[PDB]
Amino acid sequence: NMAIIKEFMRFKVHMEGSVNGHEFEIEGEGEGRPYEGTQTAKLKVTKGGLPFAWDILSPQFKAYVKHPADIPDYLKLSFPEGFKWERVMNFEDGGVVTVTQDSSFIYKVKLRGTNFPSDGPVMQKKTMGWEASSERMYALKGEIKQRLKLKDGGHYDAEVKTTYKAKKPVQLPGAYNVNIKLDITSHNEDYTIVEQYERAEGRHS
Amino acid sequence: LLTAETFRLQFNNKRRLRRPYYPRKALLCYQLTPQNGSTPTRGYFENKKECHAEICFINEIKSMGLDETQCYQVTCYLTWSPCSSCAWELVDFIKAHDHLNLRIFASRLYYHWCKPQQDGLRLLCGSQVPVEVMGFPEFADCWENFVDHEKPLSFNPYKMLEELDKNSRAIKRRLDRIKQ
RNA sequence: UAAAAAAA
RNA sequence: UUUUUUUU
Ligand SMILES: [Zn+2]
Helix, strand or coil: CCCCCCCEEEEEEEEEEEECCCEEEEEEEEEEEECEEEEEEEEEEEEEECCCHHHHHHCCCCCCEEECCCCCCCCCCCCCCCCEEEEEEEEEECEEEEEEEEEEEEEEEEEEEEECCCCCCCCCCEEEEEEEEEEECCCCEEEEEEEECCCCCCCEEEEEEEEEEECCCCCCCEEEEEEEEEEEEEEEECCCCEEEEEEEEEECC | CCCHHHHHCCCCCCCCCCCCCCCCHHHHEEECEEEECCCCCCEEEEEEEEEHHHHHHHHHHHHCCCCCCCEEEEEEEEECCCCCHHHHHHHHHHHHCCCCEEEEEECCCCCCCCCCHHCCCCCCHHEEEEEECCHHHHHHHHHHHCEECCCCCCCCCCCCHHHHHHHHHHHHHHHHCCCC
C-alpha cells in the first residue's frame, strides 16, 4: 500500500452536475499528502459559466484522511481499484442534493440538486462557509448534522448521509470519529476558479 | 492562544525574508504529554524581557508542580533555535529529572554564526535530546495545536506549504550536516 | 534596487 | 540575527 501510495500524490476530477435544471461540468486537479491529512484542489467550470452557492460542492472532495499506524486505513487500502460513494443531503428548506462518485487518481462525479427555494440561502448565496462538523463513522456509513453559516447570523442546517464502498474487501476498523476542516483558499467574484484546502484526522470514540 | 498571522510572522523564516526587514522574534511551544493518565498540557512562551523562552518555560515547569513518579515525553516546537547558554541550562535541568524525555524541533537555526552556539546544541542531539529542525508534520502539528485554528483565517491557508518545504529542504540538510 | 542558489 | 561566493 505504502509503496504505491506515495506521501505526495495528485488527482484529476471530472464532475457532471445539474442543479434545478441548470447543467454544468467541472474539471479539477489537486495535490496533497494522504498520510498527513492535508490536501489542496484547483477547480475550473467548463460549462454553464454557477447560479448557486459553491459551498454545496466542497464537502464532496476523502482519500486524504490521516490515520494512525495502529488504525487500519480502510480508504487507502481500496486502491489501486478505488472505491465509490453515494451521498444524500437534505437541506432544511427543502433543498435536495444527490451525489455519486467513483475514485480509481481519476474521480468521476455525477451530481443532481433539486427543490432549492429561489429565496433560500443557497440560491441567494447568503452562506458563509461550513462550520466544523465531527462525523462519527461506524460498507461504511456516515451521518452529519451540518451547519452552514449565514451572513446575517444563525445557521443553515442540513442532514447529510453518505455511503462509502470499497471495490476490494479489506479489514473494517472499530468505532472512531474524524475531525475535518475545509477552507476556501481563493476564488474570483463569480466562483468560477476555486482552490480548496482540507485537513482531516481520525480519533478514537 | 496564537494568531494565524503570527504563525507565519514568527515561524516562517526564509534565507531572504519578506518585505519588512527583520521583524522577527523568538517563540517556544512546549507540549507536555503525561502518558500516565493521558493528561496533556500545552503552552507557548514568547521571548520575554531578557529571559529567553527556554528559561521561562523551565521556570514554568518548575513552579507548575511536577509529579516525580511517571515519565513525560515532552515535545517542543520552537521558532528560533536555542542559544548556547540556555541550551546548557536546559541540559542541566534535564539531567536532574530522569523521568523527562524531551524532543526539540526548531524552525530556523538561529545563532550568532560563531563557535559557541555550534556545540551549544550539539551536546543535546548527542546526549539527551534528539534535536532536529522542523519539517512538514511538526509545522502542521504546531500549526493547529498551538496556533488557534478557530473560525476565522488570516489568509494563510496553505502558503506555508511551500515555505515550510523551502525551510525544511534547506535548514534540515543544514542541521544534519551540523549534527554530522 | 528585485530575486534564485550554495559554504562556514 | 551577522559574514563569504556564483547566476538571472
Ligand atoms: Zn538562550
